[PDB]
Structure formats: structure tokens, C-alpha cells
Design a binder for this molecule. Structure first.
Ligand code: ADP
Lengths: 70, 387, 95
């Protein structure tokens, strides 16, 4: 059931998200990102992402409506 | 707040006693009639009912806007942070008196209506130019000045302190004051002294700083200077070193010099051109006095020109005594060895002496004082003048 | 895991910096590109907690403060000048 759980989360992306950049994280599973839309935001993250992919403002994707690090 | 305008008797006239006794009994009557409100029906439907009602009527996200223009009574034109300018009406909630152009405002989201006003900050210019506190020593620091102190006092101090001589005759005080004499005389001393013992604001100004690599601000600095001094409070303006900046039209040349001519021009008309400033004290410091512009020299602009003489052996014994008051003094020294010898030495020279002692004795880390300390110190200042 | 799909179908978490607060449990906060706003504080947060020049979690609908986010690093305190062990042919006279 857990492995069925991971896959069903995948519908969130569907491609057209946004190209933004990771900036910083406050705490566990919540960080800050400055989008290429000129503005900056405070957002949550998915538990699926590996935390070794961070550091020096990586290229990231975000939801159009939600604007969450996916 | 503006409870009664009449001050016309200006005395202990029974008119005034009747006035202030009537106003007294009226105030007592109001305080008592309103006092009988919280007695029969002490109620509190006027603190959070109106306040809460309007706090909810107006909004949160209180977008800060900028005033553009004022039209009629309720609608004005505003400018958002990006330039979107809206023709929005204002509420009867903000102080309409403190509402002038170029001011931050509070706006709504849907209608963007003017909700409130944000109080302004303290401009950096006052912090830059105004001597904030009593900087230095009070009248125990004078080496000697009595006619100088009289002129500046009855020109400024006596007027503001006891304004019961000028309104007896309707005679206004003199406006301008030029402090001139040889250098090292103590002009800074007296300026910082009146600035120390004063009740109104004080401003210190340097003249060399009126040259921009940008072209033609200058009189910008002047006009904003007098603007802040006037708008701020009862202002005591002081400008030192106008001699190397406003002397005269020596050759009528161009290229910077012409610019300075324009600047001192704006200090002239801006000094006093139109609709006399009022509560605008002006004080000017100069070393030389002959190479000055007589158009500024004429009355209306300056009415008191004070000479700064140099005492010979009478106040010097108190100048060496002041600059040696806070210091040790061995019994080997006698101030008359150097005071009773010369008759023109400036107080700046006595200062270089009584400080040169602090350099000599403690350069070697010896004891308190020796007479040769004042000998080598006086000779050292002798080469300070002579060399 | 199963529930999160709607949870991150959510948006509004803005980020702000407080210039300084004022009375009535309010503050003055500028947004990243945008202008400055006077806003409401959260019931769980404290006015004294609000220090000037600090980030805050903001709403997007009401711009209500959610959480006063921690500063990155006090930049002068990360660039704190060295106090290393203070242990010149040509430089002895000026010594
Ligand atoms: N009579 C005096 N008593 C004490 N100090 C004096 C006296 N005359 C001059 N001085 C010293 O000489 C300095 C000259 O001051 P001032 O005349 O304002 O400078 P400038 O002549 O460059 O404008 C003062 O700072 C003061 O310390």
C-alpha cells in the first residue's frame, strides 16, 4: 500500500509546473524559493525529494496554482 | 487647543482677569456637566464600538500609497508603489489637516480608498547638519568677551528669553550678525557656547562643502537648509566660513566660479527675498571681513558686525588658567613668565601651550609639571606662529 | 502520504520582511518586489517577538502572519572580523 502511495502522488506534476529556483529551507519539509516570476515565496516540499540535492540555489520546479517544491 | 485667541491687554488688566475667570468658570461647567454623565449613566459605547466598527470597515493588508494631488473634498489622486494611479475618495477618519502632497497613505484593496495616513520619518539632513545636543563647554570657557556677548545676547538671547521689550514699541530685533577678527580667536567657542546655553534649535554649517561634482545643486543645499531650519522649530542658524565662499565678483569669470556666484546669489535672495521668514535666527562667522559682498553686508540681512579683539595680559591669565585648570601644576611654574611677556597671543596659542605641556611631560612620562614645560611649550607655539 | 495530495494543492504562503511594527498588534512589512503593507499579527505570535528586519510567514488572502521565519545569518556576524592570535625590516621607528 505504501508503494501504491508513492506512485499516486506523481499526478501533481503533469509537466507544466513552473521553472523556479530553490533558495533556502527554514526547517523540516518547508523552504523558501525565489521564482523566475520575479517574486519570492515561502513553500512546503514533497517528502519524495532526496535532501542531498540542495545547496547553491538549484533549479527547481513549482506548481502553477499551489507553487510548491515538487 | 485654541480655546481663546485674545491676548490684546498684555498686562494684568481687569479685562484679562474677567476673561480668564470666565473661561475658567466655563471649563468648570463643562467638566461638571460632562461629569454628570458618568454619574447618572456611566457608559462605554464609544470606545470600541466606533473604533472596532471602522477597524473592520477599513482593511488589513493596508497597502501604503503615495499622495499625488488634492481635489475638492473627498476624492484625490493617488499613486501605487508601481505607478498605477487611482482617483479614489478618502474617508472622514484620517487627519485632513496633515494631508499634503508627497505623503504616504493607507489604501483599500477593492476600492483602494484612502484609509489612514502614515506619520513621516525624521529626515537624514537634520541628523547630518544639526548639532544634536549641547556639544561643549558653557560660559566658564570664555577667555574674554563682554561686548561680543552683549551684542549676541540682546540680539538673540534677550529677545527670546524676555520678549517684553520688542512688542512694547513694536520694534523688531536686528537680523544678521557677522563675527570677525583674526583667526584662532574663539569664534567656534562662542558659537558652540550659545549653542550650549540655548532654548531653540541650532545648526552648524561649513562652506567648503557647497561644491558638487554634479552640476548646480548648491542652492539646492541652501534652500533645503533654510527649509528645514524654518519648518522645524525656532531655528538658530550658524554658518561658519563664508569668507572663502562668498567674497565678491572678483573677475566675473565662468566655469565653477560663476556657479558659486549663483549659489551665493540663492543664499542672498533665499537669505531674505520675499515674505520674511520669521523665527529664523541667522548667525555668520568670518575670519576676514573686507572681502565680503556688500549686498549681503547691507541692513535687512545683517545688523550687527562684531569685532573680536585679542587681549594682552588680563584675560590671558584666565585662559592659561582655564587650559591649566584640569591639569597638575608643580610649584616650579608661574604663568606670568609667559603671560606678562606678550600682549597679542591668541587663545588658540594658550591652548597649544597648555596642551603642549600634556605632550612634553608625558611624552617622557615625568611628574606633574615643570617650568621648562611651559618654556618649551611657549617657544614651540612661538615657532607655530612664526614658522 | 495518501493525504498530502490535497495538502500541497494549496497556495498563499507569502514571505515578508518587517521594517518595524506599531501599536494595535500591527507591523509594517515590505514584499519582495512590491510595496509596504500594514497587516495583522498571528494569535500565536508575539509583538515583542517581532524584531525589525526579520522575515515572516504571510498569508496571500489576508496577509496574516503565520510564522516569523528565522534570519539566514547576521551578515556582520558571519563576516565577523578576525580576532586571531595577535603575535618588519623598515618599520621600527613608527613602532
Ligand atoms: N579667549 C580664549 N579662551 C580660550 N580659548 C581660546 C580663546 N581664544 C581662542 N581660543 C582657542 O582658539 C580656537 C580658535 O577658535 P575660532 O576663532 O572659532 O577658530 P577660527 O578662528 O579658525 O574660526 C578656539 O577653538 C579656542 O580653543
Amino acid at each position: 500500500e505504501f508503494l501504491h502511495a508513492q506512485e499516486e502522488v506523481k499526478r501533481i506534476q503533469s509537466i507544466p509546473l513552473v521553472i523556479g529556483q530553490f533558495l533556502e529551507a527554514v526547517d523540516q519539509n518547508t523552504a523558501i524559493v525565489g521564482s523566475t516570476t520575479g517574486s519570492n515565496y515561502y513553500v512546503r516540499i514533497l517528502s519524495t525529494i532526496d535532501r542531498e540535492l540542495l545547496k547553491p540555489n538549484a533549479s527547481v520546479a513549482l506548481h502553477k496554482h499551489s507553487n510548491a517544491l515538487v | 487647543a485654541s480655546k481663546l485667541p485674545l491676548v490684546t491687554p498684555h498686562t494684568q488688566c481687569r479685562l484679562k482677569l474677567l476673561k480668564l475667570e470666565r473661561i475658567k468658570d466655563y471649563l468648570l461647567m463643562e467638566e461638571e456637566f460632562i461629569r454628570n454623565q458618568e454619574q447618572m449613566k456611566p457608559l462605554e459605547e464609544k470606545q470600541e464600538e466606533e473604533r472596532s466598527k471602522v477597524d473592520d470597515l477599513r482593511g488589513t493588508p493596508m497597502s501604503v500609497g503615495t499622495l499625488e494631488e488634492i481635489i475638492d473634498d473627498n476624492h484625490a489622486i493617488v499613486s501605487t508603489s508601481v505607478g498605477s494611479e487611482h482617483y479614489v475618495s478618502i474617508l472622514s477618519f484620517v487627519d485632513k489637516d496633515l494631508l499634503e502632497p508627497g505623503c504616504s497613505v493607507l489604501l483599500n484593496h477593492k476600492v483602494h480608498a484612502v484609509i489612514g495616513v502614515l506619520m513621516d520619518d525624521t529626515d537624514p539632513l537634520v541628523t547630518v547638519m544639526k548639532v544634536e545636543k549641547a556639544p561643549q563647554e558653557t560660559y566658564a570657557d570664555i577667555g574674554g568677551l563682554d561686548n561680543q556677548i552683549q551684542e549676541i545676547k540682546e540680539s538673540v538671547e534677550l529677545p527670546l528669553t524676555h520678549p517684553e521689550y520688542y512688542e512694547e514699541m513694536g520694534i523688531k530685533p536686528p537680523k544678521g550678525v557677522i563675527l570677525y577678527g583674526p583667526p584662532g580667536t574663539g569664534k567656534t567657542l562662542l558659537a558652540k557656547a550659545v549653542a550650549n546655553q540655548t532654548s531653540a534649535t541650532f545648526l552648524r554649517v561649513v562652506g567648503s562643502e557647497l561644491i558638487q561634482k554634479y552640476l548646480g545643486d548648491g542652492p539646492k543645499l541652501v534652500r533645503e537648509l533654510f527649509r528645514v531650519a524654518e519648518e522645524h522649530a525656532p531655528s538658530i542658524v550658524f554658518i561658519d566660513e563664508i569668507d572663502a565662499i562668498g567674497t565678491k565678483r572678483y573677475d566675473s569669470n565662468s566655469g565653477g566660479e560663476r556657479e558659486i556666484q549663483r549659489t551665493m546669489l540663492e543664499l542672498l535672495n533665499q537669505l531674505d527675498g520675499f515674505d520674511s521668514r520669521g523665527d529664523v535666527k541667522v548667525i555668520m562667522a568670518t575670519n576676514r571681513i573686507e572681502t565680503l559682498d556688500p549686498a549681503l553686508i547691507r541692513p535687512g540681512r545683517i545688523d550687527r558686525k562684531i569685532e573680536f579683539p585679542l587681549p594682552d595680559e588680563k584675560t590671558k591669565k584666565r585662559i592659561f588658567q582655564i587650559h591649566t585648570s584640569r591639569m597638575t601644576l608643580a610649584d616650579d611654574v608661574t604663568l606670568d613668565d609667559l603671560i606678562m611677556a606678550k600682549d597679542d597671543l591668541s587663545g588658540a596659542d594658550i591652548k597649544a601651550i597648555c596642551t603642549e605641556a600634556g605632550l612634553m611631560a608625558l611624552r617622557e612620562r615625568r611628574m606633574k609639571v615643570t617650568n621648562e614645560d611651559f618654556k618649551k611649550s611657549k617657544e614651540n607655539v612661538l615657532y607655530k606662529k612664526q614658522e | 502520504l495518501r493525504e498530502e495530495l490535497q495538502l500541497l494543492q494549496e497556495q498563499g504562503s507569502y514571505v515578508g520582511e518587517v521594517v518595524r511594527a506599531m501599536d494595535k498588534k500591527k507591523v509594517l512589512v515590505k514584499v519582495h518586489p512590491e510595496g509596504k503593507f500594514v497587516v495583522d499579527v498571528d494569535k500565536n505570535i508575539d509583538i515583542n517577538d517581532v524584531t525589525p528586519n526579520c522575515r515572516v510567514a504571510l498569508r496571500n488572502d489576508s496577509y496574516t502572519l503565520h510564522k516569523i521565519l528565522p534570519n539566514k545569518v547576521d551578515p556582520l556576524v558571519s563576516l565577523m572580523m578576525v580576532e586571531k592570535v595577535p603575535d618588519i625590516g623598515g618599520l621600527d621607528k613608527q613602532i
